[PDB]
């Protein structure tokens, strides 16, 4: 018995087009259909410079924007050998972590709105509209902040942003507590989530989950502890790791990972060195407006970096960061030219949404939206 | 194993005046009355809402909204036709054609940003050498018809003169970065 389970609530899971082969109410197999959001991203990037390539990444995962620009930047610094300053690293993490918070605040309470709890959605989205007052203030666009450029980061924080991020972090433990007091204790929540989509660790490894769905099963594997790719080796934070694997562990993790991300934000705030914002290598970082206008040699680079590009040397690397969805890695083959060459984007949600087939076997049809909830399936990456 | 796991996870809470605690917190729905109480606290608290048309959400001088071609204080469009923004544009929205005007100084005969084919990433504002193209904080230009949304060659992007009073302010405050 085949059922074309589509997007239950649009605007939350946009193009979800599962084709469930059911058995009464018990689902026997879930066959997701991809491509409804397949923009030509892995082709369009081959046609544009390494700078023009960056805006696609904030548009790859639309609920955790800067994590993908941070995964791309670290793939055009893996090749460029472009050492970025300490302040660029600290800002880059303070925003990758603000993005982890922006994602878990959505991927928890959009999940909690698919399950049925209507209010956590709107509380978490007031919180997200506080964090977009930081995105929009530091770069310009509330969602797609093309801000974490290859060398360092686009431009320094405004002169009042750390004070505001602090005044937000002080009041954010309470918001997590409310999102938690409203959902963690509920017997209507546990019942809707405990023993739902349980993934034994061998399955989370096999299906390349590598995210909050690889730390549910108990595999202690965070690419901020495994492969520290910034000040992360300096910052202190504990990676919460589940013990059962059910969608109630992944929720409890995403609601603790939203507190450890608060620890990382507070650290990045309390220790942010007053250094240069971009790599001093002005052939990888366009010089400031003031310098390119006054200096002829800076003007030449501002011209050959906003038209030509880097021309990062010939290589091929797989740089993977811990994006909120999971291990978002961008395999970036680079022909010597200024344009990338098959900038393949390993995006979790392409490996997670595979897991829907075995996660939601023998679960009731109303659980198939809870699974899609805890996978944090955002179809931009799929 | 799940059978033994159940037996043990239920033999953990197996001492009187603990079975009673759990029974009175699953019968007098007590986890749920802490949900209702929080929900009430938020029912009575002030509302984080904004009656939009009259007051609008906070922005920043770096905010990227409607593209505006700036002008030099003494008229003279700031847009010398280098085509750097036409080059840097990721979506290739800007189409620039250049002609030595009769005065002799280069200028763009055609400077058409296609707003629909535009990602509002501010690359044009960065790439332009003289700050000729900047994004005005407008962001309120929803058009009834698509053809209007294609911003014509240097005529509608020349409406930035109205927004110059705010664009000059944002630039005077952002240029420090």
């Amino acid at each position: 018995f085949t059922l074309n389970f589509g997007p239950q609530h649009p605007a939350a899971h946009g193009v979800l087009r599962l084709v469930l082969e059911m058995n009464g109410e018990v689902v026997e197999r879930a066959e997701p259909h991809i491509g409804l959001l397949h923009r030509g991203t892995e082709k369009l990037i081959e046609y544009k410079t390494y700078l023009q390539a960056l805006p696609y990444f904030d548009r790859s995962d639309y609920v955790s924007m800067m994590a993908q620009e941070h995964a791309y930047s670290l793939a055009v610094e893996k090749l460029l050998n472009c050492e970025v300053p300490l302040r660029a690293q600290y800002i880059r993490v303070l925003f990758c972590e603000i993005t982890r918070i922006l994602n878990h605040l959505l991927a928890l309470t959009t999940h909690a709105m698919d399950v049925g709890a209507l209010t956590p959605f709107l509380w978490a989205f007031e919180e997200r509209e506080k964090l977009l007052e930081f995105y929009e203030r530091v770069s310009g666009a509330r969602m797609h902040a093309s801000f974490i450029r290859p060398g360092g980061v686009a431009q320094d924080l405004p002169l009042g942003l750390c004070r505001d991020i602090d005044s937000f972090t002080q009041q954010f433990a309470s918001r997590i507590d409310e999102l938690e007091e409203m959902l963690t204790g509920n017997r209507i929540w546990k019942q809707r989530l405990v023993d739902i989509g349980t993934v034994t660790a061998q399955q989370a490894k096999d299906w390349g989950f590598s995210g909050v769905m690889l730390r549910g099963p108990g595999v202690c594997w965070d690419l901020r502890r495994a492969a520290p790719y910034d000040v992360y080796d300096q910052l202190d934070f504990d990676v919460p790791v589940g013990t059962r694997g059910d969608c109630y562990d992944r929720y409890c993790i995403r609601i603790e990972e939203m507190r450890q991300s608060l620890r990382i934000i507070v650290q990045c705030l309390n220790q942010m060195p007053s250094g240069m914002i971009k790599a001093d290598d002005r052939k990888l970082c366009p010089p400031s407006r003031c310098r390119m206008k006054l200096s002829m040699e800076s003007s030449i680079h501002h011209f050959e970096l906003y038209t030509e590009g880097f021309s990062v040397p010939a290589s091929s690397t797989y740089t993977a960061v811990e994006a909120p969805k999971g291990e978002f890695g961008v395999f970036l083959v680079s022909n010597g030219s200024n344009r990338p060459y098959r900038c393949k984007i390993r995006a979790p949600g392409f490996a997670h949404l595979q897991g829907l087939d075995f996660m939601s076997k023998h679960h009731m049809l109303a659980d198939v939206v809870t699974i899609i909830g805890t996978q944090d399936i955002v179809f931009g990456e799929v | 194993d799940d059978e033994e796991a159940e037996q043990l996870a239920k033999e953990i809470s197996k001492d009187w005046s603990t079975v009673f605690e759990r029974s009175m917190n699953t019968l007098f729905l007590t986890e749920m009355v802490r949900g209702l109480s929080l929900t009430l606290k938020y029912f009575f608290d002030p509302k984080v809402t904004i009656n939009y048309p009259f007051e609008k959400g906070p922005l920043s001088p770096r905010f990227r909204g409607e593209h505006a071609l700036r002008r030099y204080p003494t008229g003279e469009e700031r847009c010398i036709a280098c085509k750097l923004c036409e080059a840097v544009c990721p979506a290739q929205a800007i189409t620039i054609e250049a002609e030595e005007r009769e005065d002799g100084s280069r200028r763009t005969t055609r400077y058409d940003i296609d707003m629909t084919k535009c990602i509002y990433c501010g690359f044009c504002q960065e790439a332009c050498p003289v700050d000729a193209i900047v994004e005005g904080p407008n962001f309120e230009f929803a058009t009834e018809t698509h053809e209007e949304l294609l911003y014509d060659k240097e005529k509608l992007l020349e409406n930035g003169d109205r927004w110059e009073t705010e664009i000059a302010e944002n630039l005077r405050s952002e240029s420090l970065y």
């Binding site: 009464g24 019942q191 023993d195 202690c220 965070d222 502890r225 504990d238 109630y248 | 796991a5 996870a9």
Partner: peptide, 24 residues
């Protein structure tokens, strides 16, 4: 249907961090 029902019993909540709390 003999499908495995979602048993809503489990072990009690105990926040499980990683071993790198104090000294890696």
């Amino acid at each position: 249907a003999a499908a495995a029902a979602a048993a809503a019993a489990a072990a009690a909540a105990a926040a499980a961090a990683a071993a790198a709390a104090a000294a890696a």
